[PDB]
Assembly symmetry: D2
C-alpha cells in the first residue's frame, strides 16, 4: 500500500487533485458521412462528437492514470449499468494488460469487479427518482472503491448513489467517468478520472442511449430531431 | 419476422435442434508455461483448458449462428452477472459487427441488452439458494429472449431463473452458454448455442472465478490444489 | 464486380468519381498530453493531428468503399513499403472481415497481397531519385490493381511508380492513401480512396517516419523542432 | 540490453539456449465446422491445426521473450515477405505495447522495421533457387538483427539468406519463426523464438499459402486433397 491511493471520503465527487479532461470546444463535430453507419442508425445520425476510436485512445490514458494511483492496491471497481458497460469493458482490458506487461510486479489482481444498476432518465429528462439495484454494499467497508460511469451531467445519479456507499464506510471513493457535461444543471459533483468535457448536448451512441436506442452504434453522436421524433415516448 | 426465431416455451433448456458444441476430450490441456501468465496468477495456474484466443474464435461462430437465427428480429439479450461479462462483451461486439457488414439490411438493432445478477456458489459448492437481482421482468412479455451465460454445470441457476422468466410470458427463450460441463450432477438443462463441452473439472480464468479470484486471467484453466488452498473460505 | 471495378487507365491519379476524404481544417490539433505517449517519444510529440483510433475508424469506411468496388472480382493490392505497412494491415483485416460477414457468395478471396518498396525521402526532402524494389510486375497484366499508400504529398512517388505499372498493361489502377496533403508542392496526383485531407505540415507517428524514427508511435503527430534537431541527418 | 542481446554469429540457426516451443503432437486437429469459414474457403478447409486466436496468444509470449532479450538496445527486425506479414504485424504490435506499458525508461524504440522478400516454393515443392529482394544489407553492420519468419521447414530459405546477412558483419543474428516443422527434410536450422512445433503436414491459412491461395483465412489448416486439386499448377 501507498498513500497515493488514499483519499478522504469528504473529497468524494469534488475532483480534488485531478488531471483535467480533454476539452471538446463548443460546436466541434465530425460528419457522420465520413464513417460507416449501419442501416438502423443511418436515418438518425448526422454529427459525431467522439469517434469510437478516439474514445478508445483516451481510455488508454485514463487506464494508465488509474494504474498509477492504485498499483499494488486491492481495488474494487463498480460498473454502473447499463450505460457504463462499454467504457468499463475497455478500462478493465487496459488495466489488466498494463499490469501484465509492467516490469514492477504485484501479487494483487489489477481489480475486483462489481455491478450496480442505477436508473434516472426517461427520454432526456430525469424522473426525479433513482432506481438502485446492487449486491449488499457492506462488502465495500474499508475498501478502495472506484465507481465507473459513462457520463456525469446533473450529478444526481452519483450524488445519490455516493451517499449509499458512504454509509458502509469505504476506505476511499473515486469516480472515473468517460464524459462530463458543461451545464448549469450540474450540482458540481465531478469525476476524478474524466475522459472528455463536452458542451450541453444530448449524446447517443457508444452505450449512450435514448430510451434504450443507439447503444450499439460505434461512435458518440448528438441526438438529432429525427431520432427524438422516432424514439421518444 | 421469420419463423426461424420461434421456439416453444416448453422447449426452454432442452437444446432441441441445436448445433452440438466443440467437444474437448477428457484430459486435454495446454501447458501454462507456453503462455504469458501475470505474477498474481503464476503460482496457481498449471493447465490451460481453453486458450483465450480459442474462446474468441469459437464465439465468432456462435455469434454467426445467433445472427442467422434472429436476423431482423427484436432480440432481448440478458447478461447473467458476474460470470458472463466477458463472453457477453465478445458476443455483442460480433453481433453488431456482423450486422454492420451484412449485405442484407435490417432497420432493427442487432440486440437490446439487459443485465440480471444471479448467485449460487461459494468455493466450488452451491449454497442451495439462488440470489436474483433484476429490473422488473415484465418487460420481457412477448419478447424473443436470449440468456447469455458463461457455464452450465448442474443447471440449477438457469432452471430456477428460467421459471421466473416463463412467468412473464416471453415469446421465445433460448440459452447461449460458452461452456457446458459433462457431469452426473446436471439436471439435463442444456443450452441452444454452446461453445464447448468439457469434462468434470472446476475451471478458473476468463471470468470463471473461485471466490472472486482469477476473473482477469486471459485463459480458461483448471483450479489447482495451490489455488484452492490459497483462496478457499 | 466488373461493372464497378472497371476504370480507364488514363484516369489513374485523377481521383475521378471519388468520395471526398474527411477534411481536417488548418490548425486543428489535439494535445499530446491527453494521450499515453511512450518514453522514447515523450520529448518529441506535442501536437496530435490524427488519433490512432480515428485512423482505424476511417479505414473501416475506406475498406467498405473498396469492398463495394471489387467484390466478386480478383483484386491485387500492393503495399508500398515501408510507410504503408500499418494502413495496409488495417485495410486488409477490414476487407477480409467485411467479405466474411457480408453473407454474399463469392469463390474469390477479398484480395491478393503484393509488396513493392519505394524510397524518395531523406529528412523531409526528396532526393530526387526513386528507389524501386519489386517482384516482376508482369504478373499485374490484365489485373485490377489497387496501390496502398500512407501519404500522397508531392505526388512524385506514385507518378513514377504509376508509369512502371502502366507499362505492363493492368486492367485497372486505383490508389488508396490514408492521407493527402494540401500543398502547392503537389503535381495534382490524387487518390481514389483517401482517408484524410490535411494542411501542409510534416507528420510523424503511426508509420509516418523521420529518418526511420517514430513509426511505432500510435498517433499521427506533427514533427516538432526538438524532433527535427535530434533526428535530422 | 547488451548482456542479454549478445550472441555469437556462429550460433545462428542452432536455437542455442532457446525456450522450447509449444509442442503439438501428431494427429492433433480441431474440426473446421466449429469455426466460421468464409465461402471461398469452405470447400477446402477441413482440419484446423492452430486456431488463429491460439496463434495470437502464443505470439504474446514470444513477444515478451523478445522484449526480455533486447530491451534498451537497438533491435533491427526483418520481415520475410510474403509469408511472415501476419506474424510480423502481431509481433510488432505486442513489442510496442509491452515496452509502452513496462514502466521502464528507454529512449530506444522497441524495434526498427525492415523488409526482405524471399521466394522458394511452387506448389509444395522448392524450385531449388532462392529469390532475394532487399535494400542494401550493409545497413545491418554492427546491428542486433532478428529475422521474422512464418515457418521453417527444410531450412533452405533461412540458411541461404543467413549467409548473405553474415557477410555484412551484424552484431548478433536470431530467428523468430511462428512454426517449425518436424521433418526428415530439415537441414537442422532452427529458430530462437519459436511458436509451435508441428508434424510433417503442409499448412495453409493465416498467411500460409498454396500458390498464393488461403492467406486471408483466419486459422492454420491442413492442405486438403480438394485444395491441392483446385489450386495446384
Ligand atoms: O448525472 P446525471 O444527470 O444523473 O446523468 C447521468 C446518468 O444517467 C444515465 O443513466 P440512465 O439513468 O439513463 O440509465 P442507463 O445507464 O441504463 O442508460 C447515465 O448513464 C448516467 O448513469
Ligand atoms: O449450472 P450451475 O451449477 O447453476 O452453475 C453455473 C452458474 O454458477 C456460476 O455463477 P456464480 O453463482 O458463481 O456467480 P458469478 O457468475 O457471479 O460467478 C456461473 O457463472 C453460472 O452462473
Ligand atoms: O508524394 P511524395 O512527395 O512522393 O511522398 C510520399 C511518399 O514518401 C514517403 O515514403 P519514403 O520515401 O519516406 O519511404 P518510406 O515509405 O519507407 O518511409 C511516404 O511513405 C510515401 O511513400
Ligand atoms: O524452410 P523452407 O523449406 O525454406 O520453407 C519456408 C519458407 O517457404 C515459404 O515461403 P515461400 O517461398 O512460399 O514464399 P512466401 O513467403 O511469399 O509464401 C515460407 O513462408 C518460408 O519463407
Ligand atoms: N445518452 C445520454 N444519457 C445521458 C444521461 C445524462 N446525460 C446524458 C446524455 O447526454 N446522453
Ligand atoms: N468458475 C467456475 N464457476 C462454475 C460454476 C459452476 N461450475 C463452475 C466451474 O467449473 N467454474
Ligand atoms: N512521415 C512523412 N513522410 C512523408 C512523405 C511525404 N510527406 C510526408 C510527411 O508529411 N510525413
Ligand atoms: N504454406 C506453407 N508454406 C510452407 C513453406 C514450407 N513449408 C510450408 C508449409 O507447410 N506451408
Ligand atoms: Mg447510467
Ligand atoms: Mg440512459
Ligand atoms: Mg454466474
Ligand atoms: Mg462464480
Ligand atoms: Mg513510403
Ligand atoms: Mg519515410
Ligand atoms: Mg516465405
Ligand atoms: Mg508460400
Amino acid at each position: 500500500g501507498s498513500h497515493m491511493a488514499s483519499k478522504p471520503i469528504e473529497d468524494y465527487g469534488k475532483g480534488k487533485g485531478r488531471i483535467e479532461p480533454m476539452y471538446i470546444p463548443d460546436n466541434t463535430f465530425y460528419n457522420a458521412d465520413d464513417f460507416l453507419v449501419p442501416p438502423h442508425c443511418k436515418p438518425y445520425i448526422d454529427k459525431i462528437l467522439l469517434p469510437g476510436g478516439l474514445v478508445k485512445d483516451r481510455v488508454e490514458k485514463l487506464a494508465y492514470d488509474i494504474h498509477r494511483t492504485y498499483f499494488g492496491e486491492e481495488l474494487h471497481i463498480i460498473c454502473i449499468l447499463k450505460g457504463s458497460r462499454g467504457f468499463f469493458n475497455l478500462l478493465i482490458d487496459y488495466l489488466a494488460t498494463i499490469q501484465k506487461y509492467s516490469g514492477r510486479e504485484s501479487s494483487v489482481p489489477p481489480f475486483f469487479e462489481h455491478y450496480v444498476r442505477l436508473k434516472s432518465y426517461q427520454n432526456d429528462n430525469s424522473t426525479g427518482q433513482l432506481t438502485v439495484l446492487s449486491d449488499d454494499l457492506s462488502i465495500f467497508r474499508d475498501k478502495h472503491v472506484l465507481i465507473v460511469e459513462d457520463i456525469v451531467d446533473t450529478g444526481f445519479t452519483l450524488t445519490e448513489f455516493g451517499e449509499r456507499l458512504k454509509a458502509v464506510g469505504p476506505k476511499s471513493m473515486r469516480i472515473a467517468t468517460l464524459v462530463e457535461k458543461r451545464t448549469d444543471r450540474s450540482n458540481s459533483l465531478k469525476g476524478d478520472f474524466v475522459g472528455f468535457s463536452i458542451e450541453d448536448v444530448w449524446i447517443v451512441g457508444c452505450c449512450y442511449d435514448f430510451n434504450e436506442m443507439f447503444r450499439d452504434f460505434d461512435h458518440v453522436a448528438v441526438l438529432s430531431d429525427a431520432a427524438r421524433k422516432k424514439f421518444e415516448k
